[PDB]
Amino acid sequence: RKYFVAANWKCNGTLESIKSLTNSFNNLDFDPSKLDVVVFPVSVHYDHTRKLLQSKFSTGIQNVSKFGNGSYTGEVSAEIAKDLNIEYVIIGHFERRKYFHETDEDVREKLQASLKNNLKAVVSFGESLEQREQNKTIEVITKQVKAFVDLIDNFDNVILVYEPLWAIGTGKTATPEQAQLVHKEIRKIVKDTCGEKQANQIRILYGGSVNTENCSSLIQQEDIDGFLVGNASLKESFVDIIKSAM
Amino acid sequence: RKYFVAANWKCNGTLESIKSLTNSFNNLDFDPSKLDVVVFPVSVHYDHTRKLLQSKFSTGIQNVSKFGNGSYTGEVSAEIAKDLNIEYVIIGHFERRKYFHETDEDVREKLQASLKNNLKAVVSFGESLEQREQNKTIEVITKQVKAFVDLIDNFDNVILVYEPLWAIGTGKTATPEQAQLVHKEIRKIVKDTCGEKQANQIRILYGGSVNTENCSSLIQQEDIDGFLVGNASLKESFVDIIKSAM
């Protein structure tokens, strides 16, 4: 599997900060055929970021509409993203599930829209503290993955992200060993539903807290293929995280 | 009051279609010191649209985050908008209240964030058919307005929009006089919640179906200060709608 390192800038950035950050990113000499590196700026920063980043960097947006073009004030359609050659989309990030009540069905429909418009999708899922403490990790993850997994038409073009919500804002820390086991089980779900070659092909990323210290311990695990990186990706030292995949 | 003609493009456009449309828009010679004309493209179209439109046309975004900068994947903060010189935001459009379950509280928090970052806000509200048929027009609008109205300090920088949901996809048609009667009640509400001078200052737009055939009859009404325009704003004849306010 080709490693996949992704920068989720979330709701952060100014024109000036992006200028300096992209410049430092550009200094890193990597081969985009040997690893995928994707930057996800804020929607209104996309053009600024795409222009400043060298071509070796892939780019995407942090959310896409479940509706097509039409009367949906505030939404960005997959059709619009296609027209702009926005390569990737993030779907089902826990923050959107949390703050904006995005459901499993929303995730399914957003993937449909994305694939129909030749967009590549980074799809997030994961269980809460309550769910894991009640021993429902597999039940929850199976349910979330099965909400969309049957739609994947190309297993290079859809990338999965495990988000250990149980270890986010709770005071708990997900170890690389724990993450690996979940990733292993995610791959098995893909095997059972899509096929063995498909399961062996698909990138499954760790989408918990990733920094320059823990990235190697995580990516070296057999079933962890990279990261969707939060606040560490807003730093110039993000290049060292990319280096763990090189 | 300075009249206010706005284009809500909703989820529509290609780079080509915007190029052609902005060009036709630029042919209209109006004085921006006497009339406000604002275009609201899709977020990812904003840069393209702003660069193509002559500066006599003000620009904004169709939605803004209720949160500040931080871990809010997919959102655009008021601070990011301010940094990009995004002048206007639409808040509480019925499509966001309907499809994405945005509440009065969301509208309030979006307005607080916007004003804190010196953005100008176009704020929508309005009653459904069921509510009008129950003779609850005033009751509903009073509640929706009072949700956010106390946040307004500068009454040139907040623009109200009446959306007659009772006449949207229902088979019913709002007459300009029926629109006027609601606009006058809205201004009365502002008067009693904020003061007389403030009510006379604030712009109140009609945000129902506006086209070239009805724009003049609407703008002639004493308490209708302009329009938030849907489908008709995607056409080159939108210049004729602007002309009705010149």
From Swiss-Prot, chains A, B:
Catalysed reactions listed for this entry: D-glyceraldehyde 3-phosphate = dihydroxyacetone phosphate
Enzyme class at the top of the EC tree: isomerase
Pfam families listed in its UniProt record: TIM
UniProt cross-references to CDD domains, sorted A to Z: TIM
Pathway: Carbohydrate biosynthesis; gluconeogenesis; Carbohydrate degradation; glycolysis; D-glyceraldehyde 3-phosphate from glycerone phosphate: step 1/1
One GO molecular-function entry: triose-phosphate isomerase activity
Gene Ontology BP, a term: glyceraldehyde-3-phosphate biosynthetic process
Effect of residue 94 to H: 6.7-fold decrease in substrate affinity
UniProt-listed Enzyme Commission number(s): 5.3.1.1
UniProt KW keywords: Gluconeogenesis, Glycolysis, Isomerase
Superkingdom field: Eukaryota
Any one of the GO CC terms: cytosol
Active site, per annotation: 93, 163
InterPro entries reported for this sequence: Aldolase_TIM (IPR013785), TIM_sf (IPR035990), TrioseP_Isoase_bac/euk (IPR022896), Triosephosphate_isomerase (IPR000652), Triosephosphate_isomerase_AS (IPR020861)
Positions of D-glyceraldehyde 3-phosphate binding: 8, 10, 169, 228, 230-231
PANTHER family recorded: TRIOSEPHOSPHATE ISOMERASE
HAMAP family per UniProt: TIM_B
Binding partners and assembly: Homodimer.
Function: Catalyzes the interconversion of glyceraldehyde 3-phosphate and dihydroxyacetone phosphate in the glycolytic and gluconeogenic pathways.
Family: Belongs to the triosephosphate isomerase family.
The name this protein goes by in its record: Triosephosphate isomerase
Organism of this sequence: Plasmodium falciparum
Organism classification: Eukaryota, Sar, Alveolata, Apicomplexa, Aconoidasida
